[PDB]
């Protein structure tokens, strides 16, 4: 079982370093060295979300390293987990929005010539962030540190602090974690995947039927992006659904391989925030030219 732990630690380390670096350079180049367009604004929002998430990896590393102890305080746990959840939701929603934008540009050229502007992009990019805040309100409302009797302290969900016995808190936790898992599997996974799939399928269908001078490059890049997103995110969502179906039995320690699968797939899910800068900004030639121009 030591193989899982060492691979998870290595993934966390490489993700932290490479994602922080890549997203920092993307933010620097797109936000300062270039004139803002709709595409640059969308990529800047994606980079900001990815960087602000990846900066918090060492907290996960030191929590797993100490076996689960949270050496920090109440406020720091609340803050870091609010940031983590907001940035993950914002990342997935912005990916879906970028896919939809590309689909609309390809399928309706006349509409984008008349209505696709920087002011409209500024108004539109508010949606994902507000949705992330609305979905993250539970983590800022109910998460707190609790002491484990072995002398440890771990910070997790406290849905029912007003009662002490396990008899009611178990039921309350089951109901709340169930609704949380349903909201997660629907909003965070099914909608973005459906949007990306439909958008890129429509783009491929049009670009292959109506005919262009060449079609290898757009299809290859679209397939890379969609496959990377699916591979990075799907296993974590499916294992989390399996967990939240049997969440009640998990709390009493009768299921452990489920937890280990969750904490292994979490690293793969987080790796997408490191893969995003390459696949979305450095598959374009001009951005690479500006990057090499900088030194």
């Amino acid at each position: 079982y030591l193989f899982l732990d060492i691979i998870t630690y290595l993934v966390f380390a490489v993700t932290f370093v490479l994602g922080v670096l890549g997203n920092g350079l993307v933010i620097w180049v797109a936000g300062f060295r270039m004139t803002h367009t709709v595409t640059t604004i969308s990529y800047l929002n994606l980079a900001v979300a990815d960087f602000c998430f990846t900066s918090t990896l060492p907290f996960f590393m030191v929590r797993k390293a100490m076996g689960g102890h949270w050496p920090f305080g109440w406020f720091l746990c609340k803050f870091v987990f609010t940031i983590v959840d907001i940035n993950l939701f914002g990342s997935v929603f912005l990916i879906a929005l970028i896919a939809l934008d590309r689909c609309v540009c390809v399928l309706h050229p006349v509409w984008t010539q008349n209505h696709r502007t920087v002011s409209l992009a500024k108004k539109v990019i508010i949606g994902p962030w507000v949705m992330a805040l609305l979905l993250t309100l539970p983590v800022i409302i109910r998460v707190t540190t609790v002491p484990g009797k072995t002398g440890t302290v771990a910070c997790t969900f406290n849905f029912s602090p007003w009662t002490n016995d396990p008899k009611e808190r178990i039921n309350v936790a089951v109901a709340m974690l169930t609704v949380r898992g349903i909201i997660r599997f629907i909003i965070g996974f099914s909608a973005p995947m459906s949007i990306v799939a439909v958008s890129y399928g429509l783009i491929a269908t049009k670009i292959h039927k109506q005919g262009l001078i060449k079609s290898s490059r757009p299809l290859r890049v679209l397939s890379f992006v969609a496959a990377a997103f699916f591979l990075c995110w799907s296993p974590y969502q499916v294992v989390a659904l399996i967990a939240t179906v049997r969440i009640r039995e998990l709390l009493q320690g009768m299921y452990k391989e489920i937890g280990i699968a969750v904490d292994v797939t979490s690293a793969l899910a987080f790796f997408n925030s490191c893969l995003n800068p390459m696949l979305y900004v450095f598959m374009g030639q001009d951005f690479r030219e500006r990057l090499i121009h900088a030194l």
């Binding site: 595409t39 540009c105 390809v106």
Partner: peptide, 10 residues
């Protein structure tokens, strides 16, 4: 359409 595809990086 071609200019949009170029701008998007595709």
């Amino acid at each position: 359409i071609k200019n949009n595809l170029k701008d998007c990086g595709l």
